[PDB]
Amino acid sequence: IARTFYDGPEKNYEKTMAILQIEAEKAELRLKELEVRRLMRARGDGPWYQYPTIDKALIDHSPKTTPDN
């Protein structure tokens, strides 16, 4: 029965080791992502949570018919 239907215990051992490693990395990545999102929403200096401003190319730098401006 063992020869025909099942395998050795080392197979399951190493499989669950790999599964545990994968899940641990995923958990760490999730926590790091939450922290990064919080920090970049608070500060706004990151790529995410960038809100549009007024483009400076719309300004007209020419004489305005009055000397002051």
């Binding site: 051992y13 669950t16 080791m17 545990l20 490693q21 899940e23 641990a24």
Partner: protein
């Protein structure tokens, strides 16, 4: 027989008295034992001889698995999952072996009680002492872990016990 080891399961040398009849009446149990022998013990012995002859023509071996030694939970980093998994597996194996040791001691105690007849209270109190020591150690190891036990919980319980022992020793040294 030769199956089990005589030191793990010890027994007294089995002193038995000789028959010293004092009557001329035919003892019936001797005749019944002889009849039972001649009528039952020989056919079963022949059948066992035949079965062992068949077994001897095809013999194969199975080997007892031997496990390596891996780092335990005390030298395991807090968030290193692989080492914790290895330590947990080793701790579970040790727990099972410990339970089987307790089982062996309990079997010794039961043989103690049954074999010594009426004077069991005195003859084999050594087995009682051995079982007391073994049970106390097993209790101090795995008493109150409860369900969902782990190596970390056992380590925490041991740390609490050592802290209590250290405090008691320090207080006693101040007497």
């Amino acid at each position: 027989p030769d199956s089990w080891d005589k030191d793990v399961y010890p027994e007294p040398p089995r002193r038995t008295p000789a028959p010293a009849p004092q009557t001329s009446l035919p003892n019936p149990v001797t005749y019944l034992t002889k009849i039972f022998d001649l009528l039952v013990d020989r056919p079963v012995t022949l059948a066992r001889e035949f079965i062992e002859q068949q077994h001897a023509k095809n013999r194969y071996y199975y080997y007892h698995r031997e496990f390596r030694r891996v780092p335990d939970i005390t030298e395991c980093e807090e968030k290193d999952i692989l080492c914790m998994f290895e330590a947990e597996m080793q701790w579970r194996r040790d727990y099972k072996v410990d339970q089987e040791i307790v089982n062996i001691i309990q079997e010794r105690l039961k043989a103690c009680q049954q074999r010594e007849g009426e004077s069991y209270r005195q003859n084999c109190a050594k087995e009682l002492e051995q079982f007391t020591q073994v049970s106390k150690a097993f209790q101090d190891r795995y008493s109150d872990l409860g369900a969902h036990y782990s190596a970390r919980k056992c380590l925490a319980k041991q740390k609490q016990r050592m802290l209590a022992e250290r405090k008691a020793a320090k207080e006693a040294a101040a007497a």
